[PDB]
Amino acid sequence: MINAIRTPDQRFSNLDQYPFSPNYLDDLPGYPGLRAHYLDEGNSDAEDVFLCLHGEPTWSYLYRKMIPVFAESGARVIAPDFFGFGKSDKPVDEEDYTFEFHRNFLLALIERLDLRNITLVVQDWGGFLGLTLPMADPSRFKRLIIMNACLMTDPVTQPAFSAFVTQPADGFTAWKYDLVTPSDLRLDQFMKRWAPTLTEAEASAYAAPFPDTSYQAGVRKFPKMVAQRDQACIDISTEAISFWQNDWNGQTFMAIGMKDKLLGPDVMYPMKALINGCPEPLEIADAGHFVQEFGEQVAREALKHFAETE
């Protein structure tokens, strides 16, 4: 019912460091005929589940360095690709992508797989969306690993979550310009610019899902939704603030990519105060926005922090 396209499988033949078998679901309530891809790694009967959410304009490939660490620790790791990204199906019209469309997919996924004892791992859009999940069913969430992300609230409630859109000119402004304007958007080139330590093979893995601009509607809409927040987004995100501040009682681990011009320290310190019991953050001096690219360290430290209370 949603007009969508699917990336040819051959586009993923040659991926670097991505030996994870695909799992797919196409029978999701509210998403008729759309196939979603997700990784399911580690012991499937584990008590702990790490749910790893990606952001713009990435995919589960982003968690490739963290997956193995978490799995070896004894947990199961779920890393889905949102519709419009990675190996998931891609709606062709930008109007089909909304905050609720992606949020509801996540709740559906979680129910479908009956996930519990979840350790939420978020960053960027993965956090804008993922941070609003617990309030919907708190019993299934137990820990949080938060990297450069915040809540899409209104400017008055949390100015820190809106100021970055406008300043600096080489921050979100540049980011959005790079993504929504080009008529021939090359994601490998964009990733190399924003994640300078990527090797060429890695960069190409980011372009793999999109053979041409027709597969990029979800890619183009994400930045627009940061700039133009709809009411449902605002209301949902505002209610999540209260959850984190007063309801949350789980364990938290925070990591900040210090060189991020978007969701760095002036967004993270403010987030830190809103999360009840959040501890001192792990600042990674050489990491930019894509904290996951220096993920092994993050995965190891978080596990160390959590054990030290369990």
Curated annotation (Swiss-Prot):
**Does this UniProt record's set of keywords contain Protein biosynthesis?**
no
Family to which this protein belongs:
Belongs to the haloalkane dehalogenase family. Type 1 subfamily.
pH dependence comment: Optimum pH is 8.2.
What protein name applies here?
Haloalkane dehalogenase
Summarizing the function annotation, the protein's role is: Catalyzes hydrolytic cleavage of carbon-halogen bonds in halogenated aliphatic compounds, leading to the formation of the corresponding primary alcohols, halide ions and protons. Has a broad substrate specificity, which includes terminally mono- and di- chlorinated and brominated alkanes (up to C4 only). The highest activity was found with 1,2-dichloroethane, 1,3-dichloropropane, and 1,2-dibromoethane.
Please state the pathway this protein functions in, per its UniProt record.
Xenobiotic degradation; 1,2-dichloroethane degradation; glycolate from 1,2-dichloroethane: step 1/4
Q: Which GO terms describe its biological process?
A: 1,2-dichloroethane catabolic process; response to toxic substance
**Quaternary structure, from the entry:** Monomer.
* Gene3D superfamilies linked: alpha/beta hydrolase
The annotated thermal profile of this protein reads: Optimum temperature is 37 degrees Celsius.
The protein's matches in NCBIfam families, at most eight in alphabetical order, are given as:
PRK00870.1
Where does the AB hydrolase-1 domain start and stop, copy by copy? Answer: 49-295
Name the positions where chloride binds: W125, W175
Which domain of life does the protein's organism represent?
A: Bacteria
**Taxonomic classification, please?**
Bacteria, Pseudomonadati, Pseudomonadota, Alphaproteobacteria, Hyphomicrobiales
Q: Which major enzyme category is it?
A: hydrolase
The organism encoding this protein is Xanthobacter autotrophicus
